[PDB]
């Protein structure tokens, strides 16, 4: 006997309603097997992978991850793949959970402007990755061609207050992290498994700040978590909380009460969270340079009353979250576009630098630039800064140590180098500082910084 | 009390019969503990890691992975290691599952032309990796010195229709992937965990095409899956199917109904599959550049009747499998040897290029070179190709975009660069194309391509 | 209802007694919830990461990993973080297991010379990583800012004979492995997840030789195993044994009878071992170049009677353990310091080289330099060595093959290159050999080797 042996499809054919991340379709709420028609369209298009950083994504349904599909174990799924006429590449699909060679791949090969279809029975309950399976497959996956299909058990999943859709991926750009412009895919980095970005939902900040997930104290939250890869395994973790349950794919095993759990490349899990105290809870890859240096952070923000008996402390801030502990960094996008257009103003730079200063510089120098007398020197009304703006460029790029005097007080400490900041970022941060806190104004350009980087002091 | 406390050995001493991958010895089918004599001989020898790519493997029993050993929990194992006189290095063994320092290592040190022996009781049921433990250990493991030992539970494993033996490893050559010739081990790549090949059973294609594993619809298949490493963790997955069961080593835990599962470096698992519909099912490392760019794919081919109610679609093809969706690529081996001998003919190149064209080029240009009018230009009877063979070399290496005219029709699309193809591969593919489909014949040499690669247009 | 709902704190406030690795505080042995006051002080200081290799660690309590904290589920923990006045950086803490944003991070921000405090209820039993959460977070973690907190179940863990504390981390130095001197942190290696050292407890040899963990035949050993990362996932394994139990964090799942288990970055597990036969049992990351080329090995040494019915073989030696199968390598530290001081003697070099010869050279040439006639040539009273010391430098760096004659006998084999040895290591090893076994004495300097490395023969 095969699994999912619930008889022939009954009722009427159902046209599946698919959702865009981070949302999920409603529970199927059905006690009979059905014929479910799924229509998914591939679109190739530029989107912002980071502020001022464009990338040509290849998408299922216009998003990364692709549209979420929700069916019932025992359903017959008639799957239609369309490839938008604007596409340059052929595409196809392999749905994990399908019983059949390639998970659908051979019968879903679809050239630009064409459509394909195939039918499969969903024998297997579980959460499953789907992805493109077109040579070169790794390229297609790296460009964003992955999503999730949920095959519900016949009785449905237990009721929760919220369901969300979060999917990790590793990305490979020719340029370095936060280097502006349209970035090509980089095959060499991809083969070496050396991503420049590691993201949830296709972009830096996709699920931070004003794009956070939400719930309230006392509520339950289910998250369908995918790892599209192509290559990385996620040390998937929630900062400041625990997972009530973690279940991989359609596995019989359910782990309970864990905070950190390994999601294979191509894998998927369902996690459950119960909100207990208010604040921001961070989903990360705890291979932690991915989370805090490459973009792999997402936020579940919980509203409600503090409970001092459980936690006396404060909400997260830029010390931990960095520059993602603001609503957004739109000013960076604006400054980058103004640079391209040749219309970059001092204020454009100031606002971009303000965004970028948070965490990156404020951890030591404070959000108001005051520092801590004798420990961290001030950027506010800083004689040392004003005396030599080129020196300040060198300090950001190359660090500073040894005894200095700032505003009449001696410091004898170490500012590490910050060479990974791009020329525009250094320029904008320093322009912000110069135009704040009674400093002398003026500006630093990306070209100024490029020159200092090419010839350290 | 110790585990495996089944009393002294009884009956007669048993001389273990070991098997070469991908086969397994028969079930022990025994209700009493025995003295089991195991004899394993190390052989160092060149073998083909890929077509036309030689490597000096270090082996247990002449194969990678090494010979499979099958005993019963509670057995006393008298283990004899011989090192063939042709060896240059000393060798030894650490069997996971042994209770004792080094898993046998100190007492199994064996110089070329010598033999060692030690005795251990198999206290622990499970599937376990064994490997060489001779300084530099990572080098010995990277050269192929690993295999599996099964310690059966006293009652035996449940009956299945087929048992197979599959073992992943990461390999480190001085040359790049598919660069021909005898490739040395590369210590720097190994320390950095940057393999050039990631393989099942010691070679590209070891378990694809005419070397696939076989079963029939309705049958059960058990696979003993090892990960010799040295360094990688496998996101081990079956495309188009599910694992009924996954059990790691001798663990009490058994996961059921999962498709993707993480196998540690040095780890091993037993998986179970039930054949439901015909076609090819791909075992991969779903860190997917390993599978589709470095060789980490193996096939279980299922024969029997289609069931359109479960899967309406077609068997896998070269779009997904690439150039491994043919029986073999023997023509590549032949062309490489002819190059070495100085006897390379046009036909040698043609046949090699035919093999390599599959997936790599046919995904877009089709297996008959017809392309898709207005979308993918033809290689068949291509005026554009014929007009400038050197341009064609540049297109393969460096890509092509922008408006072109081919056979009277405009194209305005993107062919990505394929710079990872080696000079001989480009040469052979283009010679195949030139000698097909009414194209003008002639040939492209590896030296021609080398020159274009050194000076792009 | 919240987990850990055992009522208000009762009894007297308890001042937690924290322990330094590899030791653990006693079981809490308490049946009521308490207010537990924890005081932890950050200290930045140089320590030896390897012999003659200094590193500026950032520590919780002066050690890597940081002091171990032990409380009971349901306790109220008043956590005090002090930052020593000598610090240059601000610091804070995120304790996994805390219910609240950042695991404490925002409320524990502590500038040099300051103190912070916050209160949390331990709702969640389990073993948990704590770490610094100060921008740049990955830098702080990479510098050593991590440890473990145990939250006991209310009834306590089962009694065992020994409890130990072992924590893996990946480290990123500007210099290569075993390159001497004060090594800076290397941000580029860290972002790329390319560590130069992978260690247990903050140093090479921290838990080997005379610093091994101890137990006796018949005893049970519990190890609290952390993985601070920042980036690597451990294929955590015990050579020559098995884990009776493995439990991750506070998970309900317990795996039994496994030898190899994957610990996520930021993860923690409790393992249990039962000593059965005497000898050294090696805890490793079985991504095995980490263990045997980067330092990721620790020893549990078991004393007691051999049991030939279970294991007939010998204790581990330098073939497997390499140069860590001696009590210590103090002579390397001494030679390095003498070099710095300009007082390096021949004997200083000899003793350092003696330490380094073990495994590295003795595997083939034997500990007495005799080799194996006709198979491995002698270093003892070697005419070939004496005839050309510069040739010997080239042989170590670059290898040797082909027919040679040594002490009247022909060899025709292969000595692989050993280019990863540093100039001082080559110099000291060869000085040891030259001053042993009736060889002619004299010395080889690091400068001599530097010259040969820059111009191979
Ligand atoms: C702590 C880890 C710091 C971070 C992050 C940043 N800075 Fe810093 N900065 C720090 C110290 C301890 C010092 C003094 C070094 C010494 O030799 O004692 C500095 C110094 C500066 C200066 C010069 C002095 C002054 O004007 O106050 C500048 C202009 C400066 N720092 C700028 C700066 C910016 C823009 C940062 C983010 C990109 C930044 N710093 C981070 C400590 C730390
Ligand atoms: C799709 C992803 C492709 C793959 C894989 C390969 N080619 Fe291609 N090729 C493709 C396109 C869209 C184009 C036209 C680009 C444009 O500017 O519009 C091309 C073009 C060629 C040509 C030149 C035109 C012609 O003769 O038809 C050649 C000679 C060619 N391609 C060869 C070729 C070979 C040998 C391939 C495998 C190594 C290969 N292509 C792959 C799309 C794609
Ligand atoms: C086995 C894998 C070896 C290890 C490890 C080391 N050596 Fe070696 N060495 C080995 C062989 C097989 C040979 C002969 C090569 C041949 O062409 O047949 C050698 C040779 C030497 C020599 C020269 C000959 C002699 O004096 O005996 C020297 C000086 C030498 N080896 C030194 C040496 C040192 C110092 C090592 C550790 C750093 C070392 N060898 C390791 C095999 C192996
Ligand atoms: Cu695609
Ligand atoms: Cu897949
Ligand atoms: Cu060996
Ligand atoms: Cu091992
Ligand atoms: Cu810190
Ligand atoms: Cu953490």
Enumerate domains of chain B plus CATH numbers: 14-154 (2.60.40.420), 164-324 (2.60.40.420), 330-454 (1.10.760.10)
B401 Cβ inside 6 Å of ligand 2: yes
**What secondary structure letter does DSSP report for B103?**
G
Contact assignment for B311 to A119 by CB distance below 8 Å? yes
Q: Please report where in the chains the tokens 């210099």 appear, as a residue.
A: C175
Question: Taking CB atoms and an 8 Å cutoff, what residues of chain A touch B260?
Answer: 96, 129, 248-249, 264, 266-268
Q: Count Cβ atoms below 10 Å from residue B120 Cβ, excluding itself.
A: 25
Q: Count Cβ atoms below 10 Å from residue A235 Cβ, excluding itself.
A: 28
The answer to whether the beta carbons of residues B243 and B258 sit under 8 Å apart is yes
Q: Which of C194, C280, C319 sits opposite B134 (nearest CB)?
A: C319
Q: Please report where in the chains the tokens 């420049």 appear, as a residue.
A: A196
Taking phi over 0 as left and psi of -120 to 50 as alpha, with beta for the rest, A292 belongs to alpha
Q: Which of C260, C319, C416 sits opposite B249 (nearest CB)?
A: C260
- What is the spatial distance between Cα B382 and Cα B289, in angstroms, rounded to a whole number? 32
Inter-CA distances, A57 with A80, A143, B416, Å: 21, 5, 15
- What is the spatial distance between Cα B68 and Cα B75, in angstroms, rounded to a whole number? 16
Residues in contact with C62: Cβ distance below 8 Å, sequence separation at least 6, in sequence order: C20, C41, C43, C45
- What is the spatial distance between Cα A261 and Cα A253, in angstroms, rounded to a whole number? 14
Which of C3, C89, C100 is the best substitution to test chain A (most A C-beta atoms within 10 A)? C100
Cβ within 8 Å of C, B 149-178? none
- What is the spatial distance between Cα A292 and Cα A303, in angstroms, rounded to a whole number? 24
Q: Please report where in the chains the tokens 């490739």 appear, as a residue.
A: B183
B432 Cβ inside 6 Å of ligand 2: no
Cβ within 8 Å of A, C 312-371? none
Task: Tell me the backbone φ, ψ of residue A19, rounded to 5 degrees.
Answer: -120, 155
Contact assignment for B90 to C313 by CB distance below 8 Å? no
Nearest CA to ligand 3 atom 17: C401
Q: What is the DSSP string of C403-439?
A: EEEETTEEEEEEE---TTS-HHHHHHHHHHHHTSTT-
Q: Please report where in the chains the tokens 């969300």 appear, as a residue.
A: A164
Looking only at the bridges linking them, the beta strands covering B146-152 and B69-72 are: parallel
- What is the spatial distance between Cα C405 and Cα C410, in angstroms, rounded to a whole number? 4
Q: Please report where in the chains the tokens 């619809």 appear, as a residue.
A: B217
Structure tokens at A131: 């992805």
Q: Calculate how far, in angstroms, residue A239's C-alpha sits from the geometric centre of ligand 9.
A: 6
Closest atom of ligand 3 to CA, residue C378 = 27
- What is the spatial distance between Cα B397 and Cα B413, in angstroms, rounded to a whole number? 17
The answer to whether B413 is a known ligand-binding residue is yes
The answer to whether the beta carbons of residues B4 and B73 sit under 8 Å apart is yes
Q: Which of A99, A187, A266 sits opposite B276 (nearest CB)?
A: A99
Q: What is the DSSP string of A21-75?
A: TT--PPP---SS--EEEEEEEEEEEEEEEETTEEEEEEEESSSSS--BEEEETT-
Nearest to B20 by CA among B147, B161, B205, B187: B147
Q: What is the DSSP string of A334-400?
A: HHHHHHHHT---HHHHHHHHHHHHTTTTHHHH-TTS--BTTTB---TT-HHHHH-HHHHHHHHHH-E
- What is the spatial distance between Cα B205 and Cα B210, in angstroms, rounded to a whole number? 9
Q: Measured in whole angstroms, how far is the alpha carbon of residue B46 from the centre of its chain? A: 16
Q: Which of A280, A288, A413 sits opposite C231 (nearest CB)?
A: A288
Which of C74, C89, C135 is the best substitution to test chain A (most A C-beta atoms within 10 A)? C135
Looking only at the bridges linking them, the beta strands covering C181-183 and C53-60 are: parallel
The answer to whether C145 is a known ligand-binding residue is yes
Inter-CA distances, A50 with A53, A170, B427, Å: 5, 14, 40
Q: Calculate how far, in angstroms, residue B131's C-alpha sits from the geometric centre of ligand 3.
A: 24
The answer to whether C91 is a known ligand-binding residue is yes
Would an 8 Å CB–CB cutoff place B193 in contact with chain C?
Answer: yes
Helices A446-454 & A389-398, crossing angle to 10 degrees? 60
Cβ within 8 Å of A, B 72-111? none
Helix (H, G, I), strand (E, B) or coil at C292: helix
Contact assignment for B109 to C319 by CB distance below 8 Å? yes
- What is the spatial distance between Cα C315 and Cα C305, in angstroms, rounded to a whole number? 12
Structure tokens at B309: 């109610």
Would an 8 Å CB–CB cutoff place C2 in contact with chain A?
Answer: yes
Q: Solved how?
A: X-ray
Would an 8 Å CB–CB cutoff place C249 in contact with chain A?
Answer: yes
Taking phi over 0 as left and psi of -120 to 50 as alpha, with beta for the rest, A193 belongs to left
Find residue A197's DSSP bridge partners. A171
Beta sheet of A94-95, edge-to-edge order: A69-72, A146-152, A126-131, A94-95
Taking phi over 0 as left and psi of -120 to 50 as alpha, with beta for the rest, B193 belongs to left
**What secondary structure letter does DSSP report for A446?**
H
**Chains in touch with A (≥3 Cβ pairs < 8 A):** B, C
Task: Tell me the backbone φ, ψ of residue C289, rounded to 5 degrees.
Answer: -60, -30
Helix (H, G, I), strand (E, B) or coil at A142: helix
Residue C139 Cα, gap to closest chain A Cα (Å): 9
- What is the spatial distance between Cα C226 and Cα C236, in angstroms, rounded to a whole number? 10
**What secondary structure letter does DSSP report for C389?**
H
The answer to whether the beta carbons of residues A200 and A226 sit under 8 Å apart is no
Looking only at the bridges linking them, the beta strands covering A94-95 and A126-131 are: antiparallel
């Amino acid at each position: 006997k095969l699994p999912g042996d619930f008889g022939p499809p009954r009722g009427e054919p159902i046209h599946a309603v698919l959702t865009s991340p981070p949302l999920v379709p409603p529970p199927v709420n059905r006690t009979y097997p059905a014929k479910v028609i799924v229509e998914l369209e591939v679109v190739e298009k530029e989107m912002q992978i980071s502020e001022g950083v464009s990338y040509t994504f290849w998408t299922f349904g216009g998003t990364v991850p692709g549209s979420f599909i929700r069916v019932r174990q025992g359903d017959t799924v008639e799957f239609h793949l369309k490839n938008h006429p604007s596409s340059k590449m052929p595409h196809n699909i392999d749905l994990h959970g399908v019983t059949g060679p390639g998970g659908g791949a051979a019968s879903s090969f679809t050239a630009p402007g064409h459509e394909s279809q195939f039918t499969f029975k969903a024998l297997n309950e579980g959460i499953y990755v789907y992805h493109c399976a077109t040579a070169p497959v790794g390229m297609h996956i790296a460009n964003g061609m992955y999503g999730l299909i949920l095959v519900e058990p016949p009785e449905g999943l237990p009721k929760v207050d919220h369901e969300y859709y979060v999917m990790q991926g590793d990305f490979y750009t020719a340029g370095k992290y936060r280097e502006k412009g349209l970035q090509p895919f980089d095959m060499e980095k991809a083969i070496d498994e050396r991503p420049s970005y590691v993201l949830f939902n296709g972009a830096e900040g996709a699920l931070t700040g004003d794009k956070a997930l939400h719930a309230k104290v006392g509520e339950t939250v289910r998250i369908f978590v995918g790892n599209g890869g192509p290559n990385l395994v996620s040390s998937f973790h929630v900062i400041g909380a625990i997972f009530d349950q973690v279940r991989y794919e359609g596995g019989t095993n359910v782990q309970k009460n864990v905070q950190t759990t390994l999601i294979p490349a191509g894998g998927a899990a369902v996690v459950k969270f119960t909100a207990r105290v208010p604040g921001s809870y961070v989903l990360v890859d705890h291979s932690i340079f991915r989370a805090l240096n490459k973009g792999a952070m997402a936020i579940l923000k919980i509203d409600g009353a503090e409970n001092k008996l459980v936690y006396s402390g404060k909400e997260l801030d830029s010390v931990y979250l960095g520059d993602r502990a603001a609503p957004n960094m739109s000013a960076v996008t604006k400054a980058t576009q103004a640079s391209v257009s040749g219309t970059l103003t001092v204020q454009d730079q100031v606002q971009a630098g303000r965004a970028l200063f948070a965490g990156t510089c404020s951890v030591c120098h404070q959000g108001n630039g005051a520092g801590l007398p004798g420990v961290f020197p001030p950027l506010a009304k800083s004689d040392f800064l004003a005396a030599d703006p080129k020196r300040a460029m060198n300090i950001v790029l190359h660090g500073l140590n040894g005894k200095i005097k700032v505003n009449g007080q001696e410091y004898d400490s170490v500012m590490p180098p910050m060479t990974q900041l791009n020329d525009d970022e250094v320029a904008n941060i320093l322009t912000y500082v110069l135009n704040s806190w009674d400093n002398p104004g003026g500006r630093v350009s990306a070209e100024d910084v490029k020159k200092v980087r090419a010839q350290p002091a």
